Amino acid sequence: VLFQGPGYSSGPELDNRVIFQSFSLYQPYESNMYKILATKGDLLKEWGITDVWLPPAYRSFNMARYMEGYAIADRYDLGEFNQGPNNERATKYGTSDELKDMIDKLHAAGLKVQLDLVPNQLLGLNGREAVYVTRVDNNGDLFKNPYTTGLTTRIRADLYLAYTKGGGQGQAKYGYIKEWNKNYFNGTSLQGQGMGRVMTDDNGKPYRFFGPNDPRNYLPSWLEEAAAANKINTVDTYLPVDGWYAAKDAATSDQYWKPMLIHYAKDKGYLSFMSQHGFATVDDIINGDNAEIAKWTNAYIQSRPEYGFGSEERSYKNDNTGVDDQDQFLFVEENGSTKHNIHNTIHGNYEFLVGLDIDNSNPTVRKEQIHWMNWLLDTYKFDGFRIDAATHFDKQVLLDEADVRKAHFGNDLNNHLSYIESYTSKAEKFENENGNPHLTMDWALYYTLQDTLGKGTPSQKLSTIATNSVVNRSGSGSAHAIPNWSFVNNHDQEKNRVNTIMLDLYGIKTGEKYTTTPPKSFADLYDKETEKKALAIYKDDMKRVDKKYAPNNVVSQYAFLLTNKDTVPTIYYGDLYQTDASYMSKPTLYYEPITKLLKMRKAYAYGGQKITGYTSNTSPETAGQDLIASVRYGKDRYTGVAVVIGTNPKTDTTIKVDMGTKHANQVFKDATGFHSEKLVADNKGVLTIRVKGTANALVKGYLGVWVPTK
Ligand SMILES: [Ca+2]
């Protein structure tokens, strides 16, 4: 008879929680965020923040676009080891010691903290192995080049040298797995090593070198000296095109190490490139200093598609996410079979995103993940986890994560939140089937807010904000709402909008079919100057009236988000603060209105919820098209709030907003500051509200947020 597992239940208790997403991608590499955030506990308390989502604190691949901590080179180095640029301890955000102290101070302020947990992938390991690859999309289905030739790929169980082995000193010291390798990955996003990277004969047989004596060797005439000598650069017996070998005087002479491209017959273009770079003859190379050899012989490698992305059939989708997740190799065996199970995700497919995709179906990997989570709670005292890419790996890991929390904190779920990053309703089904061990992300309301209120001149009925949510708030509300965390904006969706600007600047349309023209690559073109330009554009756009890129009616969105019954709302860092400035140095035009909306919620956001649709002059036919009221009735006469919203600047109507009988003959005041009229509720607690349409930077249509005196 076991009693381990209430699960989350949506109700007034859980509705008390508010998550602050503490970070964006565009924060500067300043190694100071922890030191600063350590001081903000009281401020956060004022707003009714209960939980702080912290960035992924792990060591970043050094060439990561944002250095943010999702491209993980070492999963156990959170600013502890000397593995940063110039062997610094600090991550983007600061040292482990600073992280420890900051968590200490934030607990001291009565807040909880979640780490951004990243089970899906690693990126940027230093050591290569040989794998077989099949060219597949994000779902692991054979890739069909839909934006180029439309041909089904013939890259099927082909030989490839990938970066698959490493993991840093953290892993090596604290890990269950001590080193990652190819066996532990379902595959990798294209690494631009090229399909001709292994040295082959004229038919297609790879060259092999196990040892000097070995009868399993298969080399050409010329390498037999280096073979007997045992001086060939190899990878798992295979010969890489970039590899060097003892050219003249094999044994007992290590001053004649030379690029083996010299007599690699299949490449007919190298010797000629070295011609037009000083080294005119076969033997001019065999002499010259390897500084200027290496320099030039390398730059050749990069010019050849057989040795780069040019042979790997990139999708060239140029998705505004900044990742073409159809750019994958599945790790297969020689016959094209695979040990890797890629259909255990919440999606059912969609195993692949970016980087070295972790085989979360491998029982050793699964033990490694439990070990990892354990070590994180134990070492850092996080209270829970924001689960990154939760819908793109073996979902067992999610259930294991819940057990890790149970083992740590018991049935005290509410004070130990976990919330999964989700953009599909399959997350809802999964959660409900398993007793709701996590908060599911309200993706649906996010897109619904963007279409009704985010868009200038909305083409979608504003009333849809009631229905088009993981929680259906129409009529009386949801009797049994799914436990959920909701948002108006986040680090990804912002980055999307910025990338859209960059694409515009680069002259690239996402999804364009390149039949007759050369395809263009966002990835190849990415540069910091263009990013700087795009950021400048983005911020200006927020401040303008007829916004082009940034969303309209940010305050209207938050006013709805922060007054909804049955949800944990999220406050996004970059909605309150300029995204690319020093951490919490510069507020936005939305800072004042939102922080106020926060004090309001904390004071007034109690009781039943009712959403009434209205007619306006602008829509006399269909009620709720452009005008609505989202009412929290209050628990007592002194709580509750009427959120009135319209989407048309012209609108000129007077509507009746019923607050219930307990709000009879009571003074209501707009908490937003937008209207300074003092309304009095009638006999029955109805408000007569004159709706004067407007258009500036904050509002397009109408916002009123009417709260009683106390
Ligand atoms: Ca995956």
Numbering used by the authors: 26 to 735
What did the paper state?
GtfC-type 4,6-α-glucanotransferase (α-GT) enzymes from Glycoside Hydrolase Family 70 (GH70) are of interest for the modification of starch into low-glycemic index food ingredients. Compared to the related GH70 GtfB-type α-GTs, found exclusively in lactic acid bacteria (LAB), GtfCs occur in non-LAB, share low sequence identity, lack circular permutation of the catalytic domain, and feature a single-segment auxiliary domain IV and auxiliary C-terminal domains. The first half-reaction is α-1,4 specific cleavage of the substrate and results in a covalent enzyme-glycosyl intermediate, which is transferred with α-1,6 specificity to an acceptor substrate in the second half-reaction, leading to isomalto-/maltooligosaccharide (IMMO/IMMP) products containing α-1,6 linked units at the non-reducing end. With a limited hydrolytic activity, GbGtfC releases mainly maltose instead of glucose from amylose V or maltoheptaose substrate, synthesizing a main product containing alternating α-1,4/α-1,6 linkages instead of consecutive α-1,6 linkages.
We determined the crystal structure of GbGtfC-ΔC at a resolution of 2.25 Å from crystals containing one protomer in the asymmetric unit consisting of residues V26-K735. Domain IV comprises 110 residues (223–332) and is much smaller than the corresponding domains in GtfB-type enzymes (usually about 170–180 residues); it connects to domain B via two loops that lie adjacent to each other. The crystallographic B-factors for domain IV are on average higher than for other domains, indicating that this domain may be flexible due to a hinged connection with domain B. Some of its residues hardly showed electron density, but since domain IV superimposed almost perfectly with that of the AlphaFold model, we confidently decided to include all residues of this domain in the crystal structure. Overall, the architecture of its binding groove closely resembles that of the 4,6-α-GT Lr121 GtfB, more than that of α-amylases: while the latter features a fully open binding groove, in GbGtfC, the presence of the two long loops A1 (residues 532–552) and B (residues 338–352) near the binding groove results in a tunnel-like architecture that encompasses donor subsites −2 and −3, similar to the situation in Lr121 GtfB.
